[PDB]
Amino acid sequence: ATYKVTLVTPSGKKEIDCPSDEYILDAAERQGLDLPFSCRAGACSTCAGKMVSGTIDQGDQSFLDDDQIAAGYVLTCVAYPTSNCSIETHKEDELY
Amino acid sequence: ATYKVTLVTPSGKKEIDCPSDEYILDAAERQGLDLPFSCRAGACSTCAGKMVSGTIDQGDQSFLDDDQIAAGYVLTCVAYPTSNCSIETHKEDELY
Amino acid sequence: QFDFDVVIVGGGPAGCTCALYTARSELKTVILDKNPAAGALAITHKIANYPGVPGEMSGDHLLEVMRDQAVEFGTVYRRAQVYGLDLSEPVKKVYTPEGIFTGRALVLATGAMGRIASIPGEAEYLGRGVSYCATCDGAFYRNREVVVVGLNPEAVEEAQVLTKFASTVHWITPKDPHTLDGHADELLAHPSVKLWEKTRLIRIKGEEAGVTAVEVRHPGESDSQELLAEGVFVYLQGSKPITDFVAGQVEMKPDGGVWVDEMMQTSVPGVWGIGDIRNTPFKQAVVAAGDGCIAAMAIDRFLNSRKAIKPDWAH
Amino acid sequence: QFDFDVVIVGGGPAGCTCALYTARSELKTVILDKNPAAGALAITHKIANYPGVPGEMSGDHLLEVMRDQAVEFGTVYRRAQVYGLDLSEPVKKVYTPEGIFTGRALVLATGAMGRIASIPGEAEYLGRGVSYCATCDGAFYRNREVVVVGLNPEAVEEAQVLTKFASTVHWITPKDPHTLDGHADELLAHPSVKLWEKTRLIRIKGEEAGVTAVEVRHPGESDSQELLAEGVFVYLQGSKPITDFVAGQVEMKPDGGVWVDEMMQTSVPGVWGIGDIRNTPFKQAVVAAGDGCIAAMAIDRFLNSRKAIKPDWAH
Ligand SMILES: Cc1cc2nc3c(=O)[nH]c(=O)nc-3n(C[C@H](O)[C@H](O)[C@H](O)COP(=O)(O)OP(=O)(O)OC[C@H]3O[C@@H](n4cnc5c(N)ncnc54)[C@H](O)[C@@H]3O)c2cc1C
Ligand SMILES: Cc1cc2nc3c(=O)[nH]c(=O)nc-3n(C[C@H](O)[C@H](O)[C@H](O)COP(=O)(O)OP(=O)(O)OC[C@H]3O[C@@H](n4cnc5c(N)ncnc54)[C@H](O)[C@@H]3O)c2cc1C
Ligand code: FES
Ligand code: FES
């Protein structure tokens, strides 16, 4: 199953395809986008984004607390799409 | 069509059934015989045998030359029976 | 990453040994190995005549030791199939799907498990639907039907590659593939794969544009079944030196092996040939390994402009 | 070879800097470094805020320079994973598979790349099939099935270790190993290795004797697969101070980091803690390096019974 992911970056929106078994960040890079990252392991917040629309699976995540997750924040480096979804990128600074 | 294959091994004769779409070696093993093999791909002659009677199809064969084929030698791992036939096993040393 | 002192095509005992010695000479060395399971030594289930290696030993565990040795001394091992070469200039160019590798010296070490085209239409439609490299041609079969011939680890891995592009992957095996004991379970779970077990490919068919179909038949049945296809990938094992990717740029012996001089160097300066690609009657692992050592030492002399061959003895 | 003035556990910027200073003080110093590619600085692709180091610089290149500095001044650098400590006596004992190292002073410098056990059954079967050290436990899995979880240089190096014992090494990665650009090609060429790419280990199960199997699953799929296994080696990267090998022998701040005084000394005399194992919010390389120098100079005063801290200037 492959889901259409629209990333809302500082430069505007860009639509990509992401297989259900691919991380958002990896799909975006494969499709020519440079998005922010450090650990690539769900252990920091450099890759933070925030959900506008739809669903993801970030069970591999280990850095955000439940209030942050419940506010729509997501680590795009370990997030699988579970629907077609919209995500604001470059959202780390809001966590601080 | 299923054919009766009599294999003449160093331990004596044994008759097996071999469907026309099964390799001699595979049929023999399925029926409890331990015969010599290495590549099992027609790319060596560890499994070499020699036609005592009847005929086989070794078009999948790819290691024997025309003189060896014309002398009755066969690679049993890629030989289909095309009749009721008899084959001497363990014949590699005779090829050379 | 891509520019090396030495590029070795093939990671059998010849190539792994050559790399062992060139890496110890502190030459930047890469092995480009199509498939570690596809060489002659890799497929021998028992080897009991390799000197220095006693007891029960399988060919693929012996090769692993040789490969790890080469890497412990600095060799870069890359899984990559070479489909072509540019030998026109002093830096040799080696074409793979993983990229273009460069070497000041090139070693051909691909062995003799090749099967010369066996099936009607195979030679005729080469480069027009018939291929031996899925990582090189697979993308051009997006949403097209393809055929894979052969039951071996190469065939399985190449078919997996093709399931990322093809509409359907028709797999033709002479026996049931569970015979490869789980290696084919993932492939067969793929919704693109149709398994044609216990069938034989009689013929590859087509037009001027290329392949349009294959003719297959169950052994003993006497009536054929046509499957439409645009790509046919053939992975059968044989006895012949794997040389077609060289495209006639080095001289071959009448027997079909690569010609070399006493220092294992081919007709083309800067290019060496070692192991069973040479097609001598002495197809044994320690002989192949020996070729690789000789070439490595000739290469070291060449690349550092030495006065003499320099031995590699313990300090 | 085993008795040292200073034993430093961990070779990141904290440990390498500590060693630089203790070695210059002509204290016999060893770094026991599990894996040079596994620390936080080592995995930084670019670092542009390390003062004194301008331009384009990767974290592992910067670490190499600091390691080389420490060794140039006499540090013994050893690849060795510490699995335990005896802090009961003035001479500290440091247990590794490479042997037992002793120091008159001990420095804990393992960083915060650690993950709390995350997978159902992981905590429950630790010491009963679940392990984080292949050089420690690998020998007990001779001719047995094992699982490696993670795609990072530690996972790759530890899997290579286990291929010398295990029947089969099941490798579970969330990304394709093509994602390390060939860095894993040797591992994957090993005949014992089965690759489970883009899969997750959702559960570890067993009996009272220990682990018998794992449940693996492709993310987004409903179907799972059970794999029989007796060893599960988990190498996932996290955010947490690497402290479990200390087994609670030094006091921890509630945050989980090692507590230390003004001079970087833990609650146990003769034992120092430096860098991100302390779990301050100031996780930067130059801060870590600073900790290491402070501890080195407190250590020099201690071990040479000086009346004051001695500055290291003019050379
Ligand atoms: C069934 C069998 C049993 C044998 N048993 C024994 C035995 O018991 N004892 C003994 O001493 N010898 C034995 N041999 C012979 C021995 O295995 C060979 O002589 C030896 O392996 C040849 O080494 P090589 O490196 O030249 O070729 P190989 O071992 O065939 O290795 C060639 C390598 O090149 C790679 N390659 C091929 N094409 C490409 C390409 N285009 N790009 C990149 N890489 C490529 C292959 O994947 C492979 O890794 C046996 C051979 C066979 C076939
Ligand atoms: C993705 C990422 C990007 C970063 N980017 C920057 C940046 O741009 N600038 C910056 O200033 N900081 C950056 N940092 C922070 C910086 O890397 C850390 O603050 C610093 O590396 C911590 O140093 P350390 O020596 O305490 O631990 P580490 O650097 O993590 O080193 C720990 C060492 O201990 C070893 N070890 C672990 N367990 C054992 C054991 N049981 N036995 C033996 N050895 C063991 C490890 O193998 C490793 O060699 C980044 C961190 C991350 C994760
Ligand atoms: S890059 Fe660190 S959590 Fe995503
Ligand atoms: S077993 Fe090798 S040709 Fe038959």
Automatic annotation (TrEMBL), chains A, B:
InterPro entries, per the entry: 2Fe-2S_ferredoxin-like_sf (IPR036010), 2Fe-2S_ferredoxin-type (IPR001041), 2Fe2S_fd_BS (IPR006058), Beta-grasp_dom_sf (IPR012675), Fd_pln (IPR010241)
One family name in Pfam for this protein: Fer2
CDD domains, per database record: fer2
Keyword Iron in annotation: yes
Entry keyword set: 2Fe-2S, Electron transport, Iron, Iron-sulfur, Metal-binding, Transport
SUPFAM superfamilies recorded: 2Fe-2S ferredoxin-like (SSF54292)
Swiss-Prot/TrEMBL GO biological process terms: electron transport chain
Transport found in the keyword field: yes
GO MF, one example: electron transfer activity
Essential cofactor(s): [2Fe-2S] cluster
UniProt-annotated binding residues for [2Fe-2S] cluster: S38, C39, R40, G42, C44, C47, C77
Superkingdom, natural source: Bacteria
2Fe-2S ferredoxin-type domain boundaries: 3-93
Protein family: Belongs to the 2Fe2S plant-type ferredoxin family.
Protein name stated in the entry: Ferredoxin
Organism: Gloeobacter violaceus (strain ATCC 29082 / PCC 7421)
Gene: petF
UniProtKB/TrEMBL annotation, chains C, D:
Entry keyword annotation includes Oxidoreductase: yes
A family per Pfam: Pyr_redox_2
Keywords: Calcium, FAD, Flavoprotein, Metal-binding, Nucleotide-binding, Oxidoreductase
Amino-acid positions noted as binding FAD in the UniProt annotation, renumbered to this chain: A14, N35, A40, L41, T44, N49, V82, D276, A285, A314
Disulfide bonds: C133-C136
Gene Ontology biological-process annotations: cell redox homeostasis
UniProt binding sites for Ca(2+): E262
Highest taxon, organism lineage: Bacteria
Protein name, UniProt field: Thioredoxin reductase
Lineage per the UniProt record: Bacteria, Bacillati, Cyanobacteriota, Cyanophyceae, Gloeobacterales
